[PDB]
Amino acid sequence: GKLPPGPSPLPVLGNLLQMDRKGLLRSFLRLREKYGDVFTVYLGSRPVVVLCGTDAIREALVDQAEAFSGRGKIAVVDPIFQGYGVIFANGERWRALRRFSLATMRDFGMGKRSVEERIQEEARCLVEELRKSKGALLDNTLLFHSITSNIICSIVFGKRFDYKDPVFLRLLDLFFQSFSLISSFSSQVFELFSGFLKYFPGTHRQIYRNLQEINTFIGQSVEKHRATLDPSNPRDFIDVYLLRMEKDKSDPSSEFHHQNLILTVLSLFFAGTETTSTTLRYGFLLMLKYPHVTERVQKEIEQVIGSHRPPALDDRAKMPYTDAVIHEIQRLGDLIPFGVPHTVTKDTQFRGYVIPKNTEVFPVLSSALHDPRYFETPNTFNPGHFLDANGALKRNEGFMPFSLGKRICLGEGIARTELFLFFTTILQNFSIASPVPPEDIDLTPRESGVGNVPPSYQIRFLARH
Ligand code: HEM
Ligand SMILES: *C(=O)Cc1ccc(C(C)(C)C)cc1
């Protein structure tokens, strides 16, 4: 039957000649226009099936969600992970690392209460930290990273850190830079010709280091727990893991090594801290660019929540507009443009084509968030996309920033919450302004790649009365 259509690949370099010089994302979209919604591009000696548009990403990830449930390697970070840990695990190892990781969070707040009170509590510390700066010029990057990070730490590490704790900031600064580098041009280059470049110095190297430092700290805490582990009273993801580890003294085919702990924690620590926050950050840029939206987002925080209490979770259900503004931020944000590398397990008959077992599939999520089919004016910040004539939230098929299928984000729950509770609580005690006029605001991503890092802007949170 053969693979989907796609430019013929030269030996070794593959389609290095049909790519675009702007990046993997821009390259895929250009290939889409000539070869369709489902095409095969060769990233080196690698045949990968690209999926563009809402319908093409669902017909695979949702309706044949079993064949497309495989995970692929990422050039730069594969060295660290090597198929280990919950994010890059595959097969039985994955199923059980998800089964665990997922149900571990549930034991510590993923049931959305003891976590809500944690997020709420964190916002309280944010509001106090910001109010203390008297609303001067600050880069909200390292501070937003903190609030979202402490939420996964409240679960995976038990403790939380201080916004000024030295060891804590170093951890966060690493996650910030490690994400930029991974999303940089060279990382996308390294994706194609890793087999050659991996012998020379470059960014892919400073990535290995950066993460190995967070690994050093991870193990350093894993031991700090080990020596104080009380079985009758597990404290966090670690303890429970060390326990599921103790209940398997003999089985050498348990998928719970020291490896999977050091690497699963890394995944949750990273993922949890990182994307939830850059989304909060990208968000507040829009909130400066389209201020009339900010005012209306506040008029709702007022009409529904008031000024006395904090924003609680159930409040989101009674704030249609604000739920849409968050949704749109998340849509035009698009922190993970082409998703995380998928692969097919079985030989998959799909749209007339046959995709070989273990062939990689790239779900172009960005192409679904921007599908003209499912969005009027896809190219502009528009809270209306998610509103019916009445003014109540309207589900949109094309809204998948967390992706779809048996491989959907675990942070779906905590993230969407962190977003809302953090977005409102801030806008409830602060109003934002920047020296850069709404007209001169440039949403254009400082770095566009596997991730989509927004520029770093100066902003100030002005107290309210
Ligand atoms: C705005 C916030 C977030 C966004 C947009 C996001 C997005 C994504 C995406 C696109 C994927 C992979 C999609 C795919 O497999 O096709 C993913 C997977 C994953 N996320 Fe996130 N994420 C966010 C926050 C979080 C948080 C807070 C956590 C944990 C606390 C987390 C943990 C994970 C894990 C463990 C996976 C891999 C699951 C698997 O491979 O089966 N993420 N996320
Ligand atoms: C949000 O999570 C940013 C992000 C996503 C995925 C990764 C990995 C997959 C660990 C490289 C890093 C940062």
Curated annotation (Swiss-Prot):
GO MF annotation: an example: heme binding
Requisite cofactors: heme
Keywords: Endoplasmic reticulum, Heme, Iron, Membrane, Metal-binding, Microsome, Monooxygenase, Oxidoreductase, Phosphoprotein
Name of the top EC class for this enzyme: oxidoreductase
Chemical reaction(s) catalysed: an organic molecule + reduced [NADPH--hemoprotein reductase] + O2 = an alcohol + oxidized [NADPH--hemoprotein reductase] + H2O + H(+)
Post-translational modification Phosphoserine, affected residues: S101
Induction remarks: By phenobarbital.
Main location per the UniProt record: endoplasmic reticulum
Topology class, membrane: Peripheral membrane protein
GO cellular component: endoplasmic reticulum membrane
Record-level GO BP terms: epoxygenase P450 pathway; xenobiotic metabolic process
Binding site for heme: C409
CDD domains: CYP2B
One Pfam family hit: p450
Signal in keyword set: no
Compartment(s) where it occurs, according to its Swiss-Prot or TrEMBL record: Endoplasmic reticulum membrane; Microsome membrane
EC numbers, comma separated: 1.14.14.1
Source organism superkingdom: Eukaryota
Similarity-based family: Belongs to the cytochrome P450 family.
Function: Cytochromes P450 are a group of heme-thiolate monooxygenases. In liver microsomes, this enzyme is involved in an NADPH-dependent electron transport pathway. It oxidizes a variety of structurally unrelated compounds, including steroids, fatty acids, and xenobiotics. In the epoxidation of arachidonic acid it has a unique preference for the 5,6-olefin.
Protein name: Cytochrome P450 2B4
Name of the gene: CYP2B4
